[PDB]
């Protein structure tokens, strides 16, 4: 089975429409069908083998347009198809999937910082609002573990956050969890084994290379080995037991570097580089095209 790491959108000089896929097995990259509308600050996810691009904002030379769009990419056809749009535009959004349903979390609309959250049902092609977070969060990292949704860090409109919370579906309720050891907005958040990882981000002073993980059983946050490159607004995903971080901004350039974290050895390594440096991409894993 040839599953690839897909990266959609992003930013460099302006928001981008690129859709490219990386194959860890042979190190090759493929440029696929461009997004219908350029966008950065979006989030990506996969359901039923289909790739979804959610929210973001088109920061172009002529303006800034926050997106409420949900678009679907089918590897079998290499075509994008529009889906029902969200209730509100959500730039610097966080996304997570629970039992085939897409959760859109926080994000911004102009100067508005959302605490609202909504859930998408693919087969029915409908969005519905669920309980809002206890905190307004943009640049929020989201991940799912054991059918529970976690919203980590971000910016509430006034301060960057080290706080995090969890959503319990059966009770449509959010509960704060132990806060991170570091304030992080724009971090990459994913799940590996039984922990929620938060990598990189911005603490208000510098882009970060530190990485910490939350044990959902012990409720503690522990630092692991730091990435080689400090990065914020990075893309992140997990493939075959390892974490992959893609691009981001390090306060100097838009990174094209892609690092891989091996939990067994607690080490990061440079595995490849994107075709061009960029930040604010959406990332997910699914079957190769054709």
């Amino acid at each position: 089975v040839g599953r690839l790491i897909y990266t959609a959108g992003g930013y460099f000089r302006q928001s981008l429409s690129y859709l490219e896929a990386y194959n860890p097995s042979n190190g090759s990259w493929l440029r696929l069908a461009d997004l219908q509308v350029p966008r950065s600050g979006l989030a990506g996810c996969v359901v039923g083998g289909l790739l979804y691009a959610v929210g973001g904002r088109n920061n172009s030379p002529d303006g800034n347009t926050d997106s409420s769009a949900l678009d679907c990419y089918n590897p079998m056809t290499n075509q994008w198809s529009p889906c029902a749009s969200m209730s509100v535009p959500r730039n610097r959004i966080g996304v997570g999937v629970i039992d085939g349903h897409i959760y859109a979390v926080g994000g911004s609309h102009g100067c508005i910082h959302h605490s609202s959250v909504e859930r998408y049902e693919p087969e029915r092609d409908e969005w519905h609002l669920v309980a809002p977070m206890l905190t307004r969060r943009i640049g929020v990292g989201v991940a799912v573990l054991n059918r529970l949704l976690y919203a980590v860090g971000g910016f509430d409109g006034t301060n960057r956050l080290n706080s995090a919370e969890c959503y319990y579906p059966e009770r449509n309720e959010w509960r704060m969890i132990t806060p991170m050891n570091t304030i992080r907005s724009g971090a990459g958040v994913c799940v590996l084994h039984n922990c929620i990882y938060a990598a990189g981000g911005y603490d208000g002073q510098d882009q970060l290379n530190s990485v910490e993980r939350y044990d959902v059983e012990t409720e503690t946050w522990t630092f692991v080995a730091p990435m080689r490159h400090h990065r914020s607004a990075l893309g992140i995903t997990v493939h075959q037991g390892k974490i992959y971080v893609l691009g981001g901004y390090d306060g100097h350039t838009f990174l094209d570097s892609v690092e891989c974290y091996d939990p067994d050895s607690d080490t990061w390594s440079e595995v490849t580089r994107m075709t061009s440096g960029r930040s604010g991409v959406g990332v997910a894993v699914t079957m190769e095209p054709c």
């Binding site: 950065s40 600050g41 724009g186 914020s232």
Partner: peptide, 9 residues
């Protein structure tokens, strides 16, 4: 420049 994203503005 947005220090978190690198984007202009």
């Amino acid at each position: 420049l947005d220090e978190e994203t690198g984007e202009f503005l």
